[PDB]
């Protein structure tokens, strides 16, 4: 985002023979950006576990990662403030 | 006296008047300067003599006046004379009294040369940088 501004000037009292002083103005700006970052999580298994474990535990794990996502975004929005 | 040739670009300048000038001064020519506030006074200010001024009518303090450094002034004569009467001498140099701003043909070491006359009634204005002689013998 870029936020510009312009300087400003005023009139002069006139006269019968002479001419006015000249006026100029100049631009300037601030600018702002948005941060970006990457976040990771893992599940790791042994071959014996994936042979012997209930498939419902894997679906429960996936659901809990999808919950940990919504927690992360909220913390990083509140950190911004 | 009246302005006849005036050049707005470096021949003269706008400035505010420091005090009222009355109709008793209308059509007289005075040498003028700038006071420490940035306004026009008779004689030298802080600036030394800055230029010459004619007003055709009285003017209030803080109104703008056009001071002349280079140009032609017609219907000219010494400041102590009566306007439209008692004109200048032909072919002679004219000097400001730095104290009163009065202009006459008498030279003096502390005075400032303002110009010279081409025929009796026309003064060629070209104001000097400073006094005639800052180091008398």
From TrEMBL, chain A:
Highest taxon of source: Viruses
Protein name as catalogued: Major capsid protein
Species the sequence originates in: Mycobacterium phage Adjutor
Primary gene name: 17
Residues of the full protein shown: 82 to 162 of 403
From TrEMBL, chain B:
Name under which the protein is recorded: Uncharacterized protein
Annotated source species: Mycobacterium phage Adjutor
Gene: 16
């Amino acid at each position: 985002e870029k936020v510009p501004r312009i300087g400003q000037f005023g009139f002069e009292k006139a006269s019968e023979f002479g001419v006015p002083e000249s006026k100029r103005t100049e631009l300037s700006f601030y600018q702002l950006a948005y941060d970006f970052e990457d976040y990771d999580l893992a599940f790791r298994y042994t071959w014996k576990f994936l042979r012997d474990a209930p498939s419902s535990q894997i679906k429960a794990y996936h659901n809990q990662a999808l919950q940990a996502d919504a927690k992360l975004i909220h913390r990083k929005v509140m950190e911004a403030i | 006296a009246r302005y006849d040739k005036y050049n707005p670009y470096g021949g003269g300048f706008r400035a505010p008047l420091a005090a009222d000038w009355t109709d008793a001064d209308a059509g007289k020519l005075y040498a003028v300067g700038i006071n420490n506030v940035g306004a026009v006074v008779k004689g030298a200010g802080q600036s030394g003599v800055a230029g010459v001024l004619v007003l055709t009518k009285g003017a209030k303090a803080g109104s703008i006046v056009d001071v002349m450094k280079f140009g032609e002034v017609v219907e000219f004569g010494p400041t102590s004379g009566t306007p439209g009467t008692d004109f200048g001498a032909a072919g002679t140099a004219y000097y400001a009294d730095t104290s009163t701003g009065a202009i006459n043909s008498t030279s003096g070491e502390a005075k400032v040369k303002v110009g010279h006359t081409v025929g009796a009634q026309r003064l060629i204005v070209a104001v000097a940088d400073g006094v005639v002689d800052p180091s008398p013998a």
